[PDB]
Design a protein around this ligand. Structure first.
Ligand SMILES: Nc1ncnc2c1ncn2[C@@H]1O[C@H](COP(=O)(O)OP(=O)(O)OP(=O)(O)O)[C@@H](O)[C@H]1O
Ligand SMILES: Nc1ncnc2c1ncn2[C@@H]1O[C@H](COP(=O)(O)OP(=O)(O)OP(=O)(O)O)[C@@H](O)[C@H]1O
Ligand SMILES: [Mg+2]
Ligand SMILES: [Mg+2]
Lengths: 106, 486, 440
DNA sequence: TTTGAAAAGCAAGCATAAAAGATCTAAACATAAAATCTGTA
């Protein structure tokens, strides 16, 4: 079942019953009738939506919210930081990498 | 007036500021302080903590053993008792002032024998062999401020309440200028003297300096945990100038601890008890007669284990009490008894009570963690095996976790768990840079004390070290059936 | 028993708010966190939820106004008392001074004393203390939030009034410091370009279409909403790469460029959107979000300090030395091979006073010339100008407080970027780029 | 007109000065209740 799959997943990652309760509580509380609650406990699709929300502001979901100029500046800064011996960079080096990158694309 | 800040919770004691040097016009104007009803002491809170019980307590046959092995209830301290008693007795009968410094590790019977010397001195003064004296007990670890000792001792001497600096000048004028015929002898127990000397050496030097005065009539017994406390708080010139008695208190041997334990258990071992068979209540002599015993080898190995490690009486008494508690727990569970032939405390009960002290829970805690936490510890152990630094950056741990997942693709468990670790089993969740519950297990290992993490806001270059050792971690990860084959 | 309002792209957040925030204290968590970055609609969604449920008793605190922990505790005590006596005016209460709260334990004692005098109420109620911007506190140590998590444990569990804490925070890493507490957390992810465009249209079209400049322009010479929405999407399409998904920055750009767009509206342009875009095309090629007197000795001292900061001191005789030799010798040959990194992209180097004065003398502009000695020496005006440059922080030192100016251990460095020194050199017609063209 | 050769340049390696700041102390600045001293009465 989906419930045993999510319990196994919690057992292998968190091993925390309060973590599971924090997801089960708005599954029960957002149900509108008894059949909806039974369907929600059959599917546990709300648990997937909850897990997606809990990761929406980490370094992955923040990356997908960037604009193309922001992404280009981030990639240029990462290139300068990878080429640097101590991983340090500033605005000028990142802009130089960005402008030669746009020039090589164009 | 508009204020720049406020102090709205100031509670100030009603303590006067004028020292004892201004209570009388001259040194010859001071009356007999012994013939004064406020001087020398010439507890209303018990009835607050009072109630009536409704049901009688069931006092089990083992509860006598437990109650009689408490620290609240002098074998082996006879030379120390003799030394302190003769120094204090000789200084009291000669109307002199002396100080005895007593040092030693906790639980070796320092405060107990100093108190017993003091009660023997009080009994001898009751027989008028020596003149009367006041007893003051000053504990440095029972204070808010270390200077409050000045407030305490003078309050025990004069009966008035002063601030600490005025109390210090009052005690100086009392021990220096007040004549010997108008004052009483004072015996002061300065317990925990290292608690009162941490900020500066004013209290130590003042209390030792007062015993050098010819008019003082002062006995100072100062008890501490190190021996070189006067030698490092004062110089050698000062400690040569006072000339205190120096007494060390070595830890008890196993035979002395054994005599202590069965002197606590002198009237209870190999004795008869009338036991109510339906409740379990026992009365020392429908009713069964039960003999009770503790074996000699149990106490012997308990006192042998304690004397090797610490040598103090508190640990030996407490493991005997814990063994009796374990035996009474099994007895009450077996007979189904409530709270309101031969019963023995065995060698195995003392073994288990000692094993709770001896063993550590670090390996047991680490073997019951989740796969992600054990993955973190395994990646950390791999990194300190490779580069040998004992501090690893967190980004290196992330890359090592990613490499261990990517390499073991043919393993059934890793193939089954990778979708959980990087997507939480969901196709709508993107592949994450950290594993699921990454910061959860990082915070859990930091809270447990397994890890140490430096303070750095860059999460990649921040370093993490094992805070326990490498061998418990190796023993923990070799227990796991998943980690030990890859 | 609660109302879930409509927020346009925050349906899940509103459902979680309805699942967690309730008037019954038995089914309400002690602590609730709403985590999201700036302009993610945390305040908007929480305000919509609490205005859709007027029976919920909420106290709003913004901890960016309180700065430190002690004013935050005092504000909690004061606002809790104020909300209770305007909520229950027929309950006689002793007005406790909030300034007596100087410790967290004092807050516990004061809240207990406030809550014991409301035991005459019928049902158990909830007090929602909204700490909107907890990690916007300026001091912000790590141990402060742990005091607020465990605050409910020190208060009586069978009290009529139970305090519920709702926290709003910005940074993910601050939240991840407290992951093992298992506090229920609702995330507010950043909007996308379509959601930002719809929110900007629905929040600004009624204000743009009813502005005074537009109704002055239609008298000087649905479709008003059409042209306001078209301006909003034109602003988004021109400036989304620059602003990112920031609602506030796009709102400032809309406010800056609305009157200049209204001022180029004609009868030929009002019903032709492409021609009206081309008529005011200058507003969409540049952001224009900006706000747009030294001595000659100060200017040349700044130029010389830049030269000292970005040229290594072993080749100055290969550039500045020009004077005829009576004694045989050789100057510096110069740098052999060029570096391929521009040194002005890095941090400035440190120099001594006399090197700066030597290069300043080298670069300062120039029978009666026999008694002239035409070379400017560092008099007190030069040192006064240098000290003025230090107190303006166009020059900096290695130490900042209790500065020993006369010690030889204290060195100096330039503190201006290349653009500032470039326009300074063009102000005095000095060729500063010629000292950097051959080096890299 | 060459020439050659000593001054200048450069770089790898390493010992050491020094920058940046983490941590802390003490002095200036500030408040406050209880006791104590002053001036009339
Ligand atoms: N010789 C002894 N005989 C009997 N009981 C003893 C003896 N020594 C210690 N104990 C028991 O152990 C307890 C600890 O003794 P005590 O308080 O005198 O130790 P201590 O040396 O002053 O310790 P600390 O430095 O921790 O204050 C006593 O209260 C008593 O119950
Ligand atoms: N879903 C929405 N529907 C309509 N307008 C919205 C919506 N989300 C945001 N807005 C508008 O954008 C403004 C900014 O949102 P808000 O102040 O709630 O963000 P926030 O995440 O609390 O910000 P901060 O971190 O700066 O405090 C709101 O005041 C509102 O005008
Ligand atoms: Mg003791
Ligand atoms: Mg807000």
């Amino acid at each position: 079942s989906n419930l045993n799959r999510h319990i196994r997943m919690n057992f292998e990652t968190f091993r925390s019953l309060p973590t599971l309760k924090n997801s089960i509580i708005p599954l029960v509380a957002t149900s509108k009738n008894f059949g909806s609650l039974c369907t929600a406990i059959k599917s546990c699709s709300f648990l997937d939506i909850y897990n997606k929300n809990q990761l929406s502001n980490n370094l992955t979901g923040r990356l997908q919210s960037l604009s193309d100029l922001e992404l280009a500046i981030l990639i240029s800064a990462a290139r300068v930081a990878l080429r640097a011996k101590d991983g340090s960079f500033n605005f000028n080096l990142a802009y130089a990498e960005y402008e030669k990158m746009i020039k090589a694309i164009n | 007036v508009i204020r720049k800040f406020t102090k709205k919770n100031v509670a100030r004691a009603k303590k006067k500021y004028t020292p004892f040097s201004k209570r009388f016009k001259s040194i010859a104007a001071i009356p007999d302080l012994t013939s004064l009803p406020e001087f020398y002491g010439n507890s209303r809170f018990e009835n607050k903590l009072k109630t009536t019980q409704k049901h009688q307590i069931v006092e089990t046959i083992f509860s006598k053993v437990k109650k009689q092995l408490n620290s609240s209830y002098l074998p082996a301290r006879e030379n120390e008792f003799a030394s302190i008693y003769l120094s204090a007795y000789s200084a009291i009968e000669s109307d002199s002032a002396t100080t005895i410094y007593v040092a030693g590790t906790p639980g070796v019977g320092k405060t107990l024998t100093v108190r017993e010397v003091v009660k023997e001195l009080l009994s001898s003064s009751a027989q008028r062999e020596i003149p009367d004296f006041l007893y003051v007990e000053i504990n440095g670890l029972k204070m808010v401020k270390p200077t409050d000792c000045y407030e305490t001792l003078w309050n025990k001497v004069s009966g008035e309440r002063l601030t600490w600096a005025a109390s210090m000048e009052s005690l100086e004028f009392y021990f220096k200028r007040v004549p010997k015929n108008k004052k009483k002898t004072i015996v002061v127990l300065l317990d925990e003297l290292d608690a009162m000397v941490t900020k500066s050496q004013d209290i130590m030097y003042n209390f030792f300096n007062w015993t050098t005065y010819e008019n003082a009539k002062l006995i100072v017994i100062a008890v501490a945990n190190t021996m070189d406390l006067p030698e490092r708080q004062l110089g050698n010139k000062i400690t040569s100038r006072i000339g205190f008695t120096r007494i060390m208190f070595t830890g008890y041997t196993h035979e002395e601890l054994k005599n202590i334990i069965d002197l606590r258990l002198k009237g209870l071992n190999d004795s008869f008890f009338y036991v109510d068979t339906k409740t379990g209540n026992a009365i020392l002599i429908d009713v069964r007669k039960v003999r009770l015993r503790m074996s000699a080898d149990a106490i012997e190995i308990a006192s042998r284990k304690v004397a090797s490690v610490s040598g103090d009486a508190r640990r030996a008494l407490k493991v005997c009490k814990r063994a009796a508690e374990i035996a009474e727990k099994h007895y009450m569970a077996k007979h189904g008894y409530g709270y309101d032939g031969v019963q023995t405390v065995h060698i195995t009960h003392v073994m288990k009570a000692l094993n709770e002290t001896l063993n550590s829970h670090v390996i047991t805690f680490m073997t019951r963690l989740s796969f992600t936490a054990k993955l973190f510890i395994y990646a950390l152990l791999n990194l300190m095996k490779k580069n040998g630094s004992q501090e690893q950056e967190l980004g290196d741990i992330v890359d090592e976790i990613k490499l261990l997942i990517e390499v073991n693709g043919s393993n059934k468990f890793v193939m089954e768990i990778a979708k959980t670790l990087f997507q939480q089993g969901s196709d709508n969740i993107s592949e994450q840079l950290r594993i699921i519950s990454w910061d959860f297990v990082l915070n859990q290992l930091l809270d447990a004390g397994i890890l140490f993490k430096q303070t750095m806001k860059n999460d990649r270059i921040c370093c993490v070290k094992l805070n326990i050792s490498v061998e418990e971690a190796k023993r923990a990860m070799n227990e796991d059936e998943t980690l030990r084959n890859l | 028993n609660v109302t879930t309002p409509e927020v346009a792209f925050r349906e899940y957040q509103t459902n979680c708010l309805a699942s967690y925030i309730s008037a019954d204290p038995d089914i309400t968590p002690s602590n609730l966190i709403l985590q999201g970055y700036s302009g993610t609609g945390k305040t908007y969604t929480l305000k919509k939820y609490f205005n859709a449920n007027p029976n919920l008793h909420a106290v709003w605190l913004e901890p960016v106004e309180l700065v430190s922990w002690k004013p935050l505790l005092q504000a909690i005590a004061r606002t809790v008392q104020y909300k209770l006596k305007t909520l229950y005016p027929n309950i006689p209460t002793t007005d406790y001074d909030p300034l007596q709260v100087e410790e967290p334990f004092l807050l516990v004692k004061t809240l207990h004393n406030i809550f014991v005098q409301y035991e005459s109420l019928q049902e158990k109620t909830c007090l929602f203390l909204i700490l909107d911007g907890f990690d916007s506190l300026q001091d912000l140590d790590a141990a402060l939030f742990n005091k607020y998590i465990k605050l409910n444990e020190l208060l009586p569990k069978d009290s009529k009034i139970n305090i519920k804490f709702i926290y709003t925070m910005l940074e993910t890493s601050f939240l991840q410091r407290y992951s093992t507490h298992c506090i229920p957390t609702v995330m507010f992810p950043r909007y996308n370009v379509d959601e930002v465009s719809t929110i900007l249209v629905m929040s600004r079209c009624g204000e743009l279409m009813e502005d005074s400049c537009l109704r002055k322009r239609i008298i000087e010479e649905d479709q008003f909403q059409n042209v306001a929405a078209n301006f909003i999407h034109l602003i988004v399409q021109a400036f989304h790469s620059y602003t990112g998904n920031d609602i506030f920055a796009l709102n400032d750009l809309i406010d800056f460029k609305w009157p200049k767009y209204v001022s180029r509206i004609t009868k030929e342009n009002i019903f032709e959107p492409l021609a009206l875009y081309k008529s005011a095309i200058k507003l969409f090629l540049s952001t224009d979000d900006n706000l747009s007197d030294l001595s000659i000795i100060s200017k040349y001292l700044l130029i010389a300090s830049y030269i000292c900061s970005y040229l290594e001191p072993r080749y100055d005789a290969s550039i500045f030395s020009r004077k005829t030799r009576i004694i045989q010798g050789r100057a510096a040959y110069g740098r052999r091979k060029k570096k391929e990194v521009n040194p002005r992209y890095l941090q400035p180097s440190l120099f001594a006073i006399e090197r700066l004065l030597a290069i300043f003398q080298a670069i300062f502009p120039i029978l009666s010339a026999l008694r002239e000695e035409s070379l400017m020496k560092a008099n007190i005006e030069v040192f006064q100008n240098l000290s003025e440059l230090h107190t303006l922080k166009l020059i900096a030192t290695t130490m900042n407080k209790n500065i020993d100016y006369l010690s030889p251990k204290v060195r100096w460095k330039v503190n201006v970027p290349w653009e500032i020194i470039k326009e300074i050199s063009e102000s005095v017609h000095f060729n500063i780029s010629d000292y950097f063209s051959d080096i890299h």
